[PDB]
Scaffold this motif. Structure first.
Motif, PDB file in Angstrom:
ATOM      1  N   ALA A  40      45.851  40.458  28.942  1.00  0.00           N
ATOM      2  CA  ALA A  40      45.813  39.199  28.591  1.00  0.00           C
ATOM      3  C   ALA A  40      45.858  38.561  30.203  1.00  0.00           C
ATOM      4  O   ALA A  40      45.024  37.770  30.376  1.00  0.00           O
ATOM      5  CB  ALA A  40      47.146  38.715  27.979  1.00  0.00           C
ATOM      6  N   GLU A  41      46.730  38.951  30.969  1.00  0.00           N
ATOM      7  CA  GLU A  41      47.141  38.068  32.101  1.00  0.00           C
ATOM      8  C   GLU A  41      45.756  38.197  32.871  1.00  0.00           C
ATOM      9  O   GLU A  41      45.469  37.101  33.364  1.00  0.00           O
ATOM     10  CB  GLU A  41      48.251  38.860  33.001  1.00  0.00           C
ATOM     11  N   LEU A  42      45.301  39.344  33.423  1.00  0.00           N
ATOM     12  CA  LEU A  42      44.162  39.277  34.093  1.00  0.00           C
ATOM     13  C   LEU A  42      43.003  38.435  33.750  1.00  0.00           C
ATOM     14  O   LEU A  42      42.519  37.395  34.179  1.00  0.00           O
ATOM     15  CB  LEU A  42      43.730  40.667  34.137  1.00  0.00           C
ATOM     16  N   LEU A  43      42.766  38.594  32.098  1.00  0.00           N
ATOM     17  CA  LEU A  43      41.768  37.663  31.455  1.00  0.00           C
ATOM     18  C   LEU A  43      41.869  36.259  32.030  1.00  0.00           C
ATOM     19  O   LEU A  43      41.034  35.722  32.643  1.00  0.00           O
ATOM     20  CB  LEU A  43      41.992  37.974  29.894  1.00  0.00           C
ATOM     21  N   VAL A  44      43.071  35.729  31.797  1.00  0.00           N
ATOM     22  CA  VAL A  44      43.505  34.248  31.933  1.00  0.00           C
ATOM     23  C   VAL A  44      42.945  33.999  33.524  1.00  0.00           C
ATOM     24  O   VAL A  44      42.230  33.128  33.639  1.00  0.00           O
ATOM     25  CB  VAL A  44      44.795  33.864  31.591  1.00  0.00           C
ATOM     26  N   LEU A  45      43.398  34.801  34.296  1.00  0.00           N
ATOM     27  CA  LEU A  45      43.386  34.625  35.832  1.00  0.00           C
ATOM     28  C   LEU A  45      41.627  34.376  35.972  1.00  0.00           C
ATOM     29  O   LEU A  45      41.192  33.444  36.221  1.00  0.00           O
ATOM     30  CB  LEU A  45      43.859  35.836  36.610  1.00  0.00           C
ATOM     31  N   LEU A  46      41.175  35.539  35.827  1.00  0.00           N
ATOM     32  CA  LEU A  46      39.505  35.592  35.967  1.00  0.00           C
ATOM     33  C   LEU A  46      39.027  34.187  35.211  1.00  0.00           C
ATOM     34  O   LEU A  46      38.478  33.337  35.996  1.00  0.00           O
ATOM     35  CB  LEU A  46      39.049  36.662  35.362  1.00  0.00           C
ATOM     36  N   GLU A  47      39.212  34.127  34.132  1.00  0.00           N
ATOM     37  CA  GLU A  47      38.526  32.951  33.116  1.00  0.00           C
ATOM     38  C   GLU A  47      39.072  31.769  33.807  1.00  0.00           C
ATOM     39  O   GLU A  47      37.990  30.987  34.206  1.00  0.00           O
ATOM     40  CB  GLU A  47      39.132  33.117  31.888  1.00  0.00           C
ATOM     41  N   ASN A  48      40.288  31.528  34.338  1.00  0.00           N
ATOM     42  CA  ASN A  48      40.546  30.229  34.767  1.00  0.00           C
ATOM     43  C   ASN A  48      39.813  29.887  36.112  1.00  0.00           C
ATOM     44  O   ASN A  48      38.939  28.967  36.054  1.00  0.00           O
ATOM     45  CB  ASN A  48      42.111  30.352  35.253  1.00  0.00           C
ATOM     46  N   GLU A  49      39.403  30.815  36.937  1.00  0.00           N
ATOM     47  CA  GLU A  49      38.687  30.533  38.133  1.00  0.00           C
ATOM     48  C   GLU A  49      37.270  30.130  37.647  1.00  0.00           C
ATOM     49  O   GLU A  49      36.895  29.119  37.891  1.00  0.00           O
ATOM     50  CB  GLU A  49      38.723  31.896  38.964  1.00  0.00           C
ATOM     51  N   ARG A  50      36.729  30.903  36.904  1.00  0.00           N
ATOM     52  CA  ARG A  50      35.377  30.568  36.217  1.00  0.00           C
ATOM     53  C   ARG A  50      35.403  29.271  35.879  1.00  0.00           C
ATOM     54  O   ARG A  50      34.581  28.460  36.020  1.00  0.00           O
ATOM     55  CB  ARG A  50      35.180  31.652  35.233  1.00  0.00           C
ATOM     56  N   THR A  51      36.313  28.673  34.797  1.00  0.00           N
ATOM     57  CA  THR A  51      36.362  27.515  34.284  1.00  0.00           C
ATOM     58  C   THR A  51      36.284  26.229  35.587  1.00  0.00           C
ATOM     59  O   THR A  51      35.468  25.543  35.195  1.00  0.00           O
ATOM     60  CB  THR A  51      37.460  27.305  33.543  1.00  0.00           C
ATOM     61  N   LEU A  52      37.165  26.711  36.569  1.00  0.00           N
ATOM     62  CA  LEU A  52      36.726  25.352  37.455  1.00  0.00           C
ATOM     63  C   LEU A  52      35.493  25.410  38.043  1.00  0.00           C
ATOM     64  O   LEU A  52      35.017  24.442  38.277  1.00  0.00           O
ATOM     65  CB  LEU A  52      38.061  25.893  38.593  1.00  0.00           C
ATOM     66  N   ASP A  53      35.162  26.711  38.491  1.00  0.00           N
ATOM     67  CA  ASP A  53      33.599  26.788  39.105  1.00  0.00           C
ATOM     68  C   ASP A  53      32.744  26.205  38.089  1.00  0.00           C
ATOM     69  O   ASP A  53      31.949  25.397  38.550  1.00  0.00           O
ATOM     70  CB  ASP A  53      33.346  28.198  39.156  1.00  0.00           C
TER      71      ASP A  53
END
Lengths: 169, 54
Positions: free
Chosen positions: A95-108
């Motif tokens: 879960a945690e890692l997922l959100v982290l990575l996804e969050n960055e991508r969304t902003l990009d």
């Protein structure tokens, strides 16, 4: 990552409420904010698909928990714990890692859109406008609400204003 | 002779079994038998459990 958000466009706009990305126009007829429906719609579709596609990959738990062991089954109990806790750990990571990575991508992703939108207007105006650099263009010809709406709609008529813009440039 | 619990010294050991359908159970005893009186006909289904709560 793309240099639009927090890059050459310093901050956001509180006055724009109808979309994530948009335009701020100021002619002799007044000033105003508008929201790019197409870009914001595409972003909404993308983010909805991302969130839902991530969510449906983890099917909801349907079973129960809880087992009991006597004093002579300790090797059993530890094993049970070693499974349960272990699985939790994995899922926590997943879960945690997922959100982290996804969050960055969304902003990009959002950054890209802004950049792309900017570039589009460039490809529409060419030498009819001057790049100030703060995020906009000063027109070399008079523009009313009609031509501004053309710029937002992507139907800018470059040849019509080419002669007037050339003289002023 | 065993240590007293609940003001009792002798003790009853409780056992159980799961009779399959179409089967017979035979009890024989000349003494020391706490016989069954009520059995249970188990109907099984997923989505259950035991939880401890207040």
């Amino acid at each position: 990552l793309f240099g639009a958000i927090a890059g050459f466009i310093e901050g956001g706009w509180t006055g724009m409420v109808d979309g994530w990305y948009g335009y701020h126009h100021q002619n002799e007829q007044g000033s105003g904010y508008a929201a790019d429906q197409k870009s914001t719609q595409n972003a909404i579709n993308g983010i909805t698909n991302k969130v839902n596609s991530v969510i449906e990959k983890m099917n909801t738990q349907f079973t129960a928990v809880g087992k009991e062991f006597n004093k002579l089954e300790r090797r059993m109990e530890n094993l049970n714990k070693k499974v349960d806790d272990g699985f939790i750990d994995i899922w926590t990571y997943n879960a945690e890692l997922l959100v982290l990575l996804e969050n960055e991508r969304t902003l990009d992703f959002h950054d890209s859109n802004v950049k792309n939108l900017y570039e589009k207007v460039k490809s529409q105006l060419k030498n009819n406008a001057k790049e100030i650099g703060n995020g906009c263009f000063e027109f070399y010809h008079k523009c009313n609400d009609e031509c501004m709406e053309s710029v937002k709609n992507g139907t800018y008529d470059y040849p019509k204003y080419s002669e007037e813009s050339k003289l002023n440039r | 002779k065993r240590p007293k619990v609940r003001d009792q010294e002798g003790r009853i050991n409780y056992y159980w079994t799961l009779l399959e359908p179409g089967d017979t159970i035979i009890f024989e005893a000349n003494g020391n038998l706490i016989a069954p009186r009520y059995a249970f006909a188990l109907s099984r289904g997923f989505g259950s459990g035991i939880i401890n709560s207040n």
